[PDB]
Ligand binder design. Sequence first.
Ligand SMILES: Nc1ncnc2c1ncn2[C@@H]1O[C@H](COP(=O)(O)O)[C@@H](OP(=O)(O)O)[C@H]1O
Ligand SMILES: CC(C)NC[C@@H]1CCc2cc(CO)c([N+](=O)[O-])cc2N1
Ligand code: NA
Length: 254
Amino acid sequence: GAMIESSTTIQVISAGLPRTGTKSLKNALEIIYHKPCYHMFEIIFNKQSDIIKWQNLIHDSHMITTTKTIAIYDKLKELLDGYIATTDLPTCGFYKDLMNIYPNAKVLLTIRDKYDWLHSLRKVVLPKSNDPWKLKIEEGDKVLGLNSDFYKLTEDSLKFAFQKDDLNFDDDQVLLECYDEYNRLVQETVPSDRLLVLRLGDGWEPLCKFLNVEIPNGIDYPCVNSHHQMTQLTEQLIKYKSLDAIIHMFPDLI
Ligand SMILES: Nc1ncnc2c1ncn2[C@@H]1O[C@H](COP(=O)(O)O)[C@@H](OP(=O)(O)O)[C@H]1O
Ligand SMILES: CC(C)NC[C@@H]1CCc2cc(CO)c([N+](=O)[O-])cc2N1
Ligand code: NA
């Protein structure tokens, strides 16, 4: 196809929850658009200074209906300046607001089997409080410079996505119910013409068709960020005590 000059603004809003192929999708969108896509990894590896800003936004987000709405929307736009898409926490819970701010953006929902999702979440993002692996995650997190404010953001952005005032994070049934309800609500809320639902394994074709772009030539659809790979990353951070000592060992993930 012909090369055209794409606008550096949010063109794709992905409402999918963590552990549903968001990092692969981030990578895929960057391959298509040649500009950055937001993701939790953007915060962890590039913009830890954003943590307090997302926290403040979530804090004020109950006021979203107006005057207050504009201030909140201004802060969201600021956070996303220079990006062409959003994926993952903390952004995904803001999908409705993002649709208002970026009326010409299309919306994606990444989904998968709910028990596979939960298993993956428990290994990487939200281990049970009595799981010994939680201590290893915390040790690796310290190597990356992530502290309690990072955990607060993770929890608060999950609660915001699930529209809960509090949440028993150690309760699998609660998390599964929230997952199902969240995915159902996205599909009820977003007009179908504006939504593409992507199941893990769908690859380039439906995505590129939805976005009116050619499938990237000779490039396989990304497959990164398995829980196994994250377990290796955690162990290597603990072993070497820095990111820069091992970053070359994780080329597409980081
Ligand atoms: N192209 C692909 N095909 C199949 N699974 C993929 C995939 N890309 C990512 N995944 C899976 O999506 C999950 C990561 O999602 P996210 O980036 O949102 O955290 C991982 O699940 P597992 O942990 O079950 O391996 C990963 O293996
Ligand atoms: C050792 C270190 C790599 N641990 C950091 C972990 C794993 C990456 C990660 C990813 C997400 C969402 O992609 C979230 N999240 O949903 O808040 C939290 C975390 N925290
Ligand atoms: Na990258």
